[PDB]
Design a protein around this ligand. Structure first.
Ligand SMILES: NC(=O)c1ccc[n+]([C@@H]2O[C@H](COP(=O)([O-])OP(=O)(O)OC[C@H]3O[C@@H](n4cnc5c(N)ncnc54)[C@H](OP(=O)(O)O)[C@@H]3O)[C@@H](O)[C@H]2O)c1
Ligand SMILES: CCOC(=O)c1csc(C)n1
Ligand SMILES: [Co+2]
Length: 159
């Protein structure tokens, strides 16, 4: 099973300037619950976005995708191809925009947090991948984050 997990603004923006223009503690908790114990695969830019004190994310096989053959990610595996990373029973692709697009053909689950923030797309933004007709969606109720933004969870599945 390869799953994708991300939070997006209602516009589809997931990243800006190399980071994220929001932070919902509830979404962090959900992210931790879904990924804990499993493989997590991220692009090198997303690895760079993690503070050194926090990586590798604990209790998970951290894998970083890079074209640089000698890129060092202390506490992670660095691979040059996404296929190399898909050997565990449950693999979560945790971003960013480029790696979501690369991983979508392998994916059968998308855990999507929609953040009710009015954030028009801009050049350079990282975006959520486009889900075509093969994906079946299940929608959660709107919730209030203690950060003051509403959010809801979508669970997309396909065979
Ligand atoms: N849920 C969220 O909202 C969420 C979650 C994660 C990240 N983000 C955001 O997403 C943004 C980063 O996304 P990104 O799209 O800019 O970068 P990315 O997908 O995080 O990583 C891109 C890098 O991955 C490597 N890569 C990409 N395609 C490759 C390929 N075909 N073969 C080998 N290596 C490849 C390259 O590394 P080298 O340059 O080392 O070759 C490339 O520079 C940040 O803003 C981050 O905060 C958001
Ligand atoms: C944003 C939802 O969950 C997170 O806190 C998180 C950990 S690592 C990463 C790229 N995002
Ligand atoms: Co699990």
């Amino acid at each position: 099973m390869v799953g994708l997990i991300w939070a997006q603004a209602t516009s589809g923006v997931i990243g800006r300037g190399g980071d994220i223009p929001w932070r919902l503690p509830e979404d962090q908790a959900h992210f931790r619950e879904i990924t804990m114990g499993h493989t997590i695969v991220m692009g090198r830019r997303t690895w760079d976005s993690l503070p050194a004190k926090v990586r590798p994310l604990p209790g998970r096989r951290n894998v970083v995708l890079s074209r640089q053959a000698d890129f060092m990610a202390s506490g992670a595996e660095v691979v040059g191809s996404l296929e190399e990373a898909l050997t565990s029973p449950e693999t979560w692709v945790i971003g960013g925009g480029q790696v979501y697009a690369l991983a979508l053909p392998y994916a059968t689950r998308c855990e999507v947090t929609e953040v009710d923030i009015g954030l028009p797309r801009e050049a350079g933004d990282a975006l959520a991948p486009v889900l075509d007709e093969t994906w079946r969606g299940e929608t959660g109720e709107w919730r209030f984050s203690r950060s003051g933004l509403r959010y809801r969870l979508y669970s997309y599945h396909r065979s």
